[PDB]
Design a protein around this nucleic acid. Structure first.
Lengths: 50, 110, 76, 88, 49, 49, 102, 71
DNA sequence: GGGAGTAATCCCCTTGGCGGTTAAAACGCGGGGGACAGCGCGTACGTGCGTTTAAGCGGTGCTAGAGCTGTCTACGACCAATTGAGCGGCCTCGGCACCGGGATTCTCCAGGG
DNA sequence: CCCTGGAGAATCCCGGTGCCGAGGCCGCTCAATTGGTCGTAGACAGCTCTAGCACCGCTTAAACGCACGTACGCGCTGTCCCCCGCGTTTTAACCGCCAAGGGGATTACTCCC
C-alpha cells in the first residue's frame, strides 16, 4: 500500500510537471498571433477562396 | 475518386500494415476494454429462441438477460487464457483444437 | 439461433483473450461448448423459475443457477 | 429493507472520506457483507454440529479455522475489543 | 468525420458546415462542444413533434 | 384481425400494384412426381430371369 | 441504539436479528452480536483503502468498478481467499510473455 | 530442519514404478516441493480442526473432516 | 339543493409496415508469418549388477491425553416498548464522458557515411 | 551495414461542454436492550482407559553408485500451409406516419341523500 501511495505521488509530480510545461506552451502560443480579426486581409482571403 | 470530390482523390494510398505489430496493438487496446462486447439483442433473441423448448410463457427480465450475458462473457475469457497458455507451451503460437481439448481435460469438464 | 455469436464477435472475444493468431477451424467447437453451457444454465433457470412456478425469470434465478453450478459471479 | 448503505458510507468516510462512489458499488459491498456472513455462519454451524451444543468463542474459532491467519489475528483482536465494549 | 474535424477546432478554417438532419443525432457530442453564432433549419416540416 | 391501421395498406397495394406484385402468373409446368411404378419391381423380374 | 452501546459503526442489532432468524444451531450464543460485523468492517476497510489508492492512481476520484477489480486482484492473499468470482465490468490485469514481446 | 531429509531414492523408485524414460533431479525436486506444500496445506486445516475440537491428540475424525472439506 | 354511472375528452398510445439511413457481417488474396518434416547429438536414465541398511516384524510396561460420569451454576431462550439508526422523495454541480492539441518517444522509410 | 532526418501518431493531460449523483432535509418508523425468569447445558472435579512411546534387535530389501548404451527434444536445416489486413457488399435497427381505440373521471342527466 505504501508502494502504491508513492507511485501515486510520483504520478502526481509527473502530471504536475506536464501541466506546467503544457500550460507554458499554450500561454506562449496564445499571445504569439492575433490576426484573424483585421478586416483588411479578409478581402485577400475572400478573393483567394473565390 | 469515384466522382466529384475535394479535388483529386486517392489519398488513401497503399498503406497496408503487416501483422504482429497490428495484432499486438489491437490486443493491447482490447485488454483495457471492460464493458460488454457482443451484441445484446441477438443474445436475448437466441436465449428466448432456446427457452420455449422447456415451456412457453416463461417471460424474462432485463436483469436476467444481463446476468446471463455477464456469466457467459466472463467465463470463456479464462478459457481463452488457458488455451493460449497451453498453445504457447508448445511450439504453436496459433490456436488449434489440441490445446483447447487439453484445457478441457485439465479444468475438469465433468 | 446457431449464429448468435457471429464470426467477428468470436474473433474479437479471442483477441481480448490474448491470442497471437486464431485459426479458422476453432470457433465451431467453442460455439458448441458455449451452447452446451447456455443450455445448462437456461435449464437450471427454468427449473428454479418453477420453484414457485413464477411466470418470469429474474437475475435471482440465474445467479442461483450459477452459484450452485460452481462458476460464481459477482458485480451485484 | 434494512441495508448497509449508511454503514457503507460511514466506513467510506472512515477509510477514504474524500473518495466518492458509483451507483452499483454499494450492491457489491452489501453482497460481500452478507454472503461472507452467511458462509462463515454456515461453516461455524457445521463445525458445531459434531460437538454437543443445545457466541464470541464460536465465531472466533470459525474465523480462525478457514479464514487466513493474517486476517484472523486482526479479527480476534477486534472481536475481543467489541465484546469488551459491549460488557463495558 | 474525424479527418474533417481535425482541422476544425483551433482556427477559423470554415464558416458553414454542411450537415444533414440525421447526422447531428449521433454526432451531438462534437456539435454541442462548439458554440454556433447562427443555425438554419431548412424544411422545418422535418421536425414537428 | 382487430388492428386496422394498415388494413387499408393492402387496399392501397392492390390499387397501385394491380396484382402484378401480389401474385404473377408463372410459367406453367406439369407435376414432377418421381417415385415411378417400377421403383420396386426390377428386383423381382431380375431374379425371375 | 446498538451502535453506540457497542461503539461500532456498522449496525449489529439488525445483523443479530438476521442471525437469530437464521437459527443455524440450537445453541446460539448472543453475547457477540458484532463479531462478524467487526470482521466484515475490517475486510471492507482494507478493500476500500486498496480501491481508494487504485482510484487515485489514475486520477479517478470516483471508484470505477475496474478499479475495484484491480484492487481485489492485485493481492496474493485476496485472490487466494476468493478467486472464483467474476465481477461486473471485468478486465484482467495486463500481462505479457517473454516470447510474445521482445 | 528435517524437511530436507527426505530420501531422494524414494522418489527415484516412485518414478521408476510410475514410468517415464527421463526423470531428472529437477522432476524429483519439484514433486517433493509440491508434495510438501500439499501436506502443509492439509495439515493446517487438520491442526485447526484439532484446535477447534477441544482435543490435543490427532485422531481419524480430524483428518476425515479435513478431507471432506478439501474434497 | 347537491353527488355518482353513463356520454365524452383528454393525450398520447397503441398498432405495422414503411422509406432512409448509417453501423456490422461476409466476402477475395499475395505473401508471408506460421506450422511441419529431416538429421545428428549427447546425455542421461533403464538395468544388472556388489554392497550396506532402515522399516518390519513380535512382544512389552505402562501412561498421558482421551472417554467419560454427576452436577450445578454461567448462561442460552424469554416477551413488553420506545426513541433511535436508518430508509425513502429531491435536488443541486462538478467527476466523469468524449474528442481535439501538441511533445516524446514507438516505429518504419529514405538516405549518409 | 549503424546512424540521422522525417513523418504518422500513442499517450497526457488539458481543456470544454453536458449531465446527473451523494447526501442532506423532512417524515416516520421498526426493532435492541433493558427487566426479568425458565431451564439448561457445558465446564468443574472424578474415575478411568487404552493403545502410543519408546524400548528391546536381526533381517531382508531400499540406499544407492556405476558402466553399457542408446532415445529422442531440440539445435540447425529445408519444406511449405492459410492467418490477416485492404477494398467491397449485404443485413439491421431506429426515427418517424399514418389513424382508430384508451381509459378515470366527474360533471349534464337523472336518481339517491
Amino acid at each position: 500500500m505504501e508502494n502504491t501511495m508513492k507511485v501515486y505521488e510520483k504520478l502526481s509530480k509527473a502530471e504536475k510537471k506536464r501541466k506546467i510545461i503544457q500550460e507554458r506552451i499554450r500561454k506562449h502560443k496564445e499571445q504569439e498571433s492575433q490576426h484573424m480579426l483585421t478586416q483588411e486581409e479578409r478581402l485577400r482571403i475572400a478573393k483567394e477562396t473565390e | 475518386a469515384r466522382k466529384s470530390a475535394p479535388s483529386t482523390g486517392g489519398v488513401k494510398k497503399p498503406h497496408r500494415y503487416k501483422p504482429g505489430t497490428v495484432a499486438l496493438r489491437e490486443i493491447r487496446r482490447f485488454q483495457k476494454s471492460t464493458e460488454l462486447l457482443i451484441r445484446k439483442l441477438p443474445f436475448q433473441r437466441l436465449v428466448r429462441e432456446i427457452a420455449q423448448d422447456f415451456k412457453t410463457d416463461l417471460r424474462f427480465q432485463s436483469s436476467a438477460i444481463g446476468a446471463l450475458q455477464e456469466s457467459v462473457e466472463a467465463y470463456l475469457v479464462s478459457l481463452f487464457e488457458d488455451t493460449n497458455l497451453a498453445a504457447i507451451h508448445a511450439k504453436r503460437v496459433t490456436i488449434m483444437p489440441k490445446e483447447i481439448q487439453l484445457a478441457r481435460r485439465l479444468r475438469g469438464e465433468r | 439461433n446457431i449464429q448468435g455469436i457471429t464470426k467477428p464477435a468470436i474473433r474479437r472475444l479471442a483477441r481480448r483473450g490474448g491470442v497471437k493468431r486464431i485459426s479458422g477451424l476453432i470457433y465451431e467447437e467453442v460455439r458448441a461448448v458455449l451452447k452446451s453451457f447456455l443450455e445448462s444454465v437456461i435449464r437450471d433457470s427454468v427449473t428454479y423459475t418453477e420453484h414457485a412456478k413464477r411466470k418470469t425469470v429474474t437475475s435471482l434465478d440465474v445467479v442461483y443457477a450459477l452459484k450452485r453450478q460452481g462458476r460464481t459471479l459477482y458485480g451485484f | 429493507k434494512e441495508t448497509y448503505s449508511s454503514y457503507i458510507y460511514k466506513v467510506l468516510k472512515q477509510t477514504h472520506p474524500d473518495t466518492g462512489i458509483s451507483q452499483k458499488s454499494m450492491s457489491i459491498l452489501n453482497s460481500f457483507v452478507n454472503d461472507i456472513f452467511e458462509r462463515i455462519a454456515t461453516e461455524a454451524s457445521k463445525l458445531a454440529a459434531y460437538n454437543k451444543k443445545s457466541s464470541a468463542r464460536e465465531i472466533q474459532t470459525a474465523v480462525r479455522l478457514i479464514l487466513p491467519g493474517e486476517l484472523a489475528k486482526h479479527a480476534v483482536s477486534e472481536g475481543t475489543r467489541a465484546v469488551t465494549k459491549y460488557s463495558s | 468525420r474525424k479527418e474533417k474535424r481535425k482541422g476544425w477546432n483551433k482556427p477559423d478554417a470554415f464558416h458553414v458546415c454542411i450537415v444533414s438532419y440525421q447526422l447531428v443525432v449521433q454526432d451531438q457530442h462534437s456539435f454541442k462542444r462548439k458554440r454556433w453564432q447562427y443555425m438554419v433549419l431548412d424544411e422545418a416540416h422535418n421536425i414537428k413533434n | 384481425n382487430f388492428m386496422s391501421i394498415v388494413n387499408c395498406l393492402m387496399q392501397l397495394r392492390k390499387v397501385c400494384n394491380h396484382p402484378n406484385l401480389f401474385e404473377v402468373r408463372p410459367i406453367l409446368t406439369s407435376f414432377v412426381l418421381e417415385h415411378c411404378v417400377a421403383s420396386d419391381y426390377k428386383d423381382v423380374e431380375r431374379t425371375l430371369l | 441504539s446498538r451502535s453506540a452501546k457497542a461503539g461500532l459503526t456498522f449496525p449489529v442489532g439488525r445483523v443479530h436479528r438476521l442471525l437469530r432468524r437464521g437459527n443455524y444451531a440450537q445453541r446460539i450464543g448472543s453475547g457477540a452480536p458484532v463479531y462478524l460485523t467487526a470482521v466484515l468492517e475490517y475486510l471492507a476497510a482494507e478493500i476500500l483503502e486498496l480501491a481508494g489508492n487504485a482510484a487515485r492512481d489514475n486520477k479517478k476520484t470516483r471508484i470505477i468498478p475496474r478499479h475495484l477489480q484491480l484492487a481485489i486482484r492485485n493481492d496474493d492473499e485476496l485472490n487466494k481467499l476468493l478467486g472464483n468470482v467474476t465481477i461486473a465490468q471485468g478486465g484482467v490485469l495486463p500481462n505479457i510473455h517473454q516470447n510474445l514481446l521482445p
